[PDB]
Symmetry: C2
Subunit: 130 residues, 2 copies
Amino acid sequence: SNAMHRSRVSTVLIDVPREQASRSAQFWAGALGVRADSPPGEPQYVTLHGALPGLVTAVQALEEGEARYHLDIETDDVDAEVERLVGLGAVEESSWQGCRTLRVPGGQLVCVIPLHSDPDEFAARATSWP
Amino acid sequence: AMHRSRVSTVLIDVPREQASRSAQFWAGALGVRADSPPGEPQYVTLHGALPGLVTAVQALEEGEARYHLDIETDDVDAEVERLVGLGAVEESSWQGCRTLRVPGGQLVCVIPLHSDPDEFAARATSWP
Protein backbone atom coordinates (compact mmCIF):
# COMPACT_ATOMS: atom_id res chain seq x y z
CA SER A 1 0.00 0.00 0.00
CA ASN A 2 2.35 2.74 1.28
CA ALA A 3 4.36 4.29 -1.57
CA MET A 4 8.14 3.98 -1.27
CA HIS A 5 9.45 7.31 -0.06
CA ARG A 6 11.83 8.86 2.48
CA SER A 7 11.59 10.98 5.63
CA ARG A 8 13.37 12.36 8.69
CA VAL A 9 12.94 14.98 11.40
CA SER A 10 14.40 18.18 9.89
CA THR A 11 13.20 21.02 12.10
CA VAL A 12 12.64 21.86 15.76
CA LEU A 13 10.02 24.60 16.29
CA ILE A 14 9.42 26.84 19.30
CA ASP A 15 5.78 27.89 18.89
CA VAL A 16 4.79 31.08 20.70
CA PRO A 17 1.78 33.42 20.59
CA ARG A 18 2.57 36.14 18.04
CA GLU A 19 2.70 38.87 20.74
CA GLN A 20 5.54 37.03 22.57
CA ALA A 21 7.47 35.98 19.44
CA SER A 22 10.13 38.72 19.49
CA ARG A 23 10.68 38.28 23.24
CA SER A 24 11.04 34.51 22.66
CA ALA A 25 13.56 34.96 19.82
CA GLN A 26 15.50 37.40 22.01
CA PHE A 27 15.71 34.79 24.78
CA TRP A 28 16.68 31.86 22.57
CA ALA A 29 19.33 33.92 20.71
CA GLY A 30 20.96 34.76 24.08
CA ALA A 31 20.35 31.32 25.59
CA LEU A 32 21.85 29.38 22.66
CA GLY A 33 24.39 32.00 21.54
CA VAL A 34 22.99 32.19 18.03
CA ARG A 35 22.02 34.63 15.30
CA ALA A 36 18.30 35.10 14.76
CA ASP A 37 16.42 36.44 11.73
CA SER A 38 13.41 35.72 9.51
CA PRO A 39 13.68 34.16 6.03
CA PRO A 40 12.16 35.87 2.97
CA GLY A 41 8.53 34.76 2.53
CA GLU A 42 8.48 33.39 6.09
CA PRO A 43 7.94 36.38 8.47
CA GLN A 44 6.17 34.08 10.98
CA TYR A 45 9.50 32.27 11.52
CA VAL A 46 12.69 33.45 13.19
CA THR A 47 15.53 31.09 12.36
CA LEU A 48 17.95 30.32 15.20
CA HIS A 49 21.02 29.76 13.05
CA GLY A 50 23.18 26.72 13.86
CA ALA A 51 21.35 26.02 17.15
CA LEU A 52 21.27 22.23 16.71
CA PRO A 53 23.46 19.88 14.66
CA GLY A 54 21.97 18.59 11.39
CA LEU A 55 18.64 20.37 11.98
CA VAL A 56 16.92 23.73 11.45
CA THR A 57 15.63 25.45 14.61
CA ALA A 58 13.16 28.35 14.66
CA VAL A 59 10.66 30.35 16.67
CA GLN A 60 7.25 30.28 14.98
CA ALA A 61 4.62 32.92 15.74
CA LEU A 62 1.19 31.46 16.53
CA GLU A 63 -1.93 33.35 15.41
CA GLU A 64 -3.90 31.41 18.05
CA GLY A 65 -3.32 28.86 20.82
CA GLU A 66 -0.80 28.25 23.58
CA ALA A 67 2.98 27.93 23.50
CA ARG A 68 4.54 24.57 22.71
CA TYR A 69 7.31 22.88 20.78
CA HIS A 70 6.84 20.67 17.75
CA LEU A 71 8.88 18.69 15.21
CA ASP A 72 8.67 18.77 11.41
CA ILE A 73 9.13 15.53 9.51
CA GLU A 74 10.55 16.41 6.10
CA THR A 75 9.58 14.07 3.28
CA ASP A 76 9.63 13.67 -0.52
CA ASP A 77 6.02 12.41 -0.40
CA VAL A 78 3.81 14.29 2.06
CA ASP A 79 0.61 12.29 1.38
CA ALA A 80 2.43 8.95 1.65
CA GLU A 81 4.21 10.02 4.86
CA VAL A 82 1.02 11.25 6.52
CA GLU A 83 -0.54 7.87 5.56
CA ARG A 84 2.39 5.98 7.07
CA LEU A 85 2.27 7.93 10.36
CA VAL A 86 -1.52 7.53 10.63
CA GLY A 87 -0.90 3.79 10.14
CA LEU A 88 1.30 3.97 13.25
CA GLY A 89 -1.53 5.54 15.27
CA ALA A 90 -1.12 9.26 14.58
CA VAL A 91 -4.24 11.28 13.81
CA GLU A 92 -4.45 14.12 11.28
CA GLU A 93 -5.75 17.36 12.77
CA SER A 94 -6.70 20.65 11.11
CA SER A 95 -4.11 22.47 9.03
CA TRP A 96 -1.93 24.27 11.57
CA GLN A 97 0.36 27.12 10.53
CA GLY A 98 -0.01 26.07 6.89
CA CYS A 99 1.29 22.55 7.63
CA ARG A 100 -0.24 19.09 7.54
CA THR A 101 -0.42 18.39 11.27
CA LEU A 102 -0.77 15.15 13.26
CA ARG A 103 -1.34 14.38 16.93
CA VAL A 104 0.85 11.38 17.75
CA PRO A 105 0.25 8.66 20.35
CA GLY A 106 1.19 10.33 23.65
CA GLY A 107 -0.31 13.70 22.65
CA GLN A 108 2.46 15.70 20.92
CA LEU A 109 2.06 17.43 17.57
CA VAL A 110 4.22 16.83 14.50
CA CYS A 111 4.00 18.46 11.09
CA VAL A 112 4.74 16.69 7.81
CA ILE A 113 6.41 19.03 5.33
CA PRO A 114 7.92 18.83 1.85
CA LEU A 115 11.62 18.87 0.94
CA HIS A 116 13.65 21.94 1.92
CA SER A 117 17.21 20.52 2.01
CA ASP A 118 20.17 19.81 -0.25
CA PRO A 119 19.33 16.50 -1.99
CA ASP A 120 22.69 15.02 -0.91
CA GLU A 121 22.05 15.97 2.74
CA PHE A 122 18.51 14.59 2.67
CA ALA A 123 19.74 11.33 1.08
CA ALA A 124 22.42 10.98 3.79
CA ARG A 125 19.98 11.47 6.71
CA ALA A 126 16.51 10.39 5.53
CA THR A 127 15.11 6.96 6.32
CA SER A 128 13.82 4.97 3.33
CA TRP A 129 10.37 3.41 3.64
CA PRO A 130 9.50 0.57 3.83
CA ALA B 1 32.96 30.85 34.99
CA MET B 2 34.05 30.40 32.19
CA HIS B 3 31.53 27.63 31.56
CA ARG B 4 30.05 26.09 28.40
CA SER B 5 26.61 24.91 27.30
CA ARG B 6 24.61 23.46 24.38
CA VAL B 7 21.22 21.87 23.77
CA SER B 8 22.05 18.13 24.01
CA THR B 9 18.70 16.39 24.35
CA VAL B 10 15.18 16.45 22.89
CA LEU B 11 12.57 14.95 25.22
CA ILE B 12 9.12 13.64 24.43
CA ASP B 13 7.32 13.88 27.79
CA VAL B 14 4.27 11.66 28.16
CA PRO B 15 2.01 10.49 30.99
CA ARG B 16 3.45 7.19 32.26
CA GLU B 17 0.36 5.22 31.12
CA GLN B 18 1.00 6.40 27.51
CA ALA B 19 4.81 5.93 27.58
CA SER B 20 4.89 2.49 25.92
CA ARG B 21 2.60 3.53 23.06
CA SER B 22 4.66 6.72 22.57
CA ALA B 23 7.94 4.80 22.35
CA GLN B 24 6.36 2.30 19.92
CA PHE B 25 5.15 5.12 17.70
CA TRP B 26 8.40 7.09 17.64
CA ALA B 27 10.50 3.94 17.04
CA GLY B 28 8.31 3.22 14.00
CA ALA B 29 7.98 6.84 12.90
CA LEU B 30 11.73 7.53 12.98
CA GLY B 31 13.01 4.02 12.19
CA VAL B 32 15.07 3.69 15.35
CA ARG B 33 15.76 1.24 18.14
CA ALA B 34 14.16 2.22 21.44
CA ASP B 35 15.19 1.10 24.92
CA SER B 36 15.83 2.40 28.43
CA PRO B 37 19.32 3.22 29.69
CA PRO B 38 20.49 1.27 32.72
CA GLY B 39 19.62 3.31 35.85
CA GLU B 40 17.13 5.48 33.92
CA PRO B 41 13.91 3.45 33.56
CA GLN B 42 11.89 6.70 33.19
CA TYR B 43 13.46 7.22 29.73
CA VAL B 44 13.23 5.26 26.50
CA THR B 45 16.08 6.37 24.24
CA LEU B 46 15.36 6.71 20.53
CA HIS B 47 18.82 5.76 19.29
CA GLY B 48 20.27 8.01 16.59
CA ALA B 49 16.95 9.79 15.97
CA LEU B 50 18.76 13.15 15.75
CA PRO B 51 22.48 12.60 15.20
CA GLY B 52 24.63 14.79 17.46
CA LEU B 53 21.84 14.84 20.06
CA VAL B 54 20.08 12.38 22.33
CA THR B 55 16.32 11.91 21.89
CA ALA B 56 14.12 10.10 24.40
CA VAL B 57 10.58 9.50 25.57
CA GLN B 58 10.24 10.46 29.25
CA ALA B 59 7.49 8.90 31.36
CA LEU B 60 5.86 11.57 33.54
CA GLU B 61 4.59 10.83 37.05
CA GLU B 62 2.17 13.72 36.52
CA GLY B 63 1.25 16.51 34.11
CA GLU B 64 0.28 16.75 30.45
CA ALA B 65 2.23 15.74 27.35
CA ARG B 66 4.84 18.18 26.06
CA TYR B 67 8.30 18.31 24.56
CA HIS B 68 11.27 19.90 26.28
CA LEU B 69 14.96 20.51 25.64
CA ASP B 70 17.90 19.82 27.95
CA ILE B 71 20.73 22.32 28.06
CA GLU B 72 23.92 20.39 28.87
CA THR B 73 26.61 22.24 30.81
CA ASP B 74 29.79 21.83 32.83
CA ASP B 75 28.39 24.24 35.47
CA VAL B 76 24.68 23.70 36.18
CA ASP B 77 24.36 26.41 38.86
CA ALA B 78 26.12 29.05 36.70
CA GLU B 79 24.05 28.15 33.61
CA VAL B 80 20.76 28.37 35.53
CA GLU B 81 21.87 31.78 36.83
CA ARG B 82 22.76 32.89 33.29
CA LEU B 83 19.42 31.76 31.82
CA VAL B 84 17.50 33.33 34.70
CA GLY B 85 19.34 36.58 33.86
CA LEU B 86 17.88 36.32 30.34
CA GLY B 87 14.31 36.05 31.74
CA ALA B 88 13.85 32.34 32.49
CA VAL B 89 12.20 31.42 35.79
CA GLU B 90 13.24 28.35 37.78
CA GLU B 91 10.39 26.00 38.69
CA SER B 92 10.40 23.22 41.28
CA SER B 93 12.67 20.24 40.57
CA TRP B 94 10.90 18.40 37.75
CA GLN B 95 11.59 14.72 37.05
CA GLY B 96 14.89 15.05 38.97
CA CYS B 97 16.14 17.96 36.80
CA ARG B 98 16.77 21.67 37.26
CA THR B 99 13.82 23.05 35.28
CA LEU B 100 13.20 26.55 33.91
CA ARG B 101 10.18 28.22 32.30
CA VAL B 102 11.53 30.38 29.46
CA PRO B 103 10.05 33.59 28.02
CA GLY B 104 7.27 32.29 25.78
CA GLY B 105 6.27 29.52 28.19
CA GLN B 106 8.29 26.48 27.13
CA LEU B 107 10.28 24.37 29.57
CA VAL B 108 13.98 23.66 29.50
CA CYS B 109 16.09 21.60 31.85
CA VAL B 110 19.71 22.33 32.74
CA ILE B 111 21.72 19.13 33.13
CA PRO B 112 25.37 18.12 33.71
CA LEU B 113 27.82 16.73 31.12
CA HIS B 114 26.93 13.39 29.49
CA SER B 115 28.47 13.50 25.98
CA ASP B 116 31.66 12.58 24.14
CA PRO B 117 33.91 15.53 25.19
CA ASP B 118 34.84 16.23 21.53
CA GLU B 119 31.17 16.35 20.55
CA PHE B 120 30.35 18.68 23.45
CA ALA B 121 33.23 21.01 22.48
CA ALA B 122 32.23 21.07 18.81
CA ARG B 123 28.66 22.07 19.69
CA ALA B 124 28.99 24.12 22.90
CA THR B 125 29.25 27.88 23.47
CA SER B 126 31.52 29.43 26.10
CA TRP B 127 30.04 31.96 28.55
CA PRO B 128 31.87 34.63 30.59
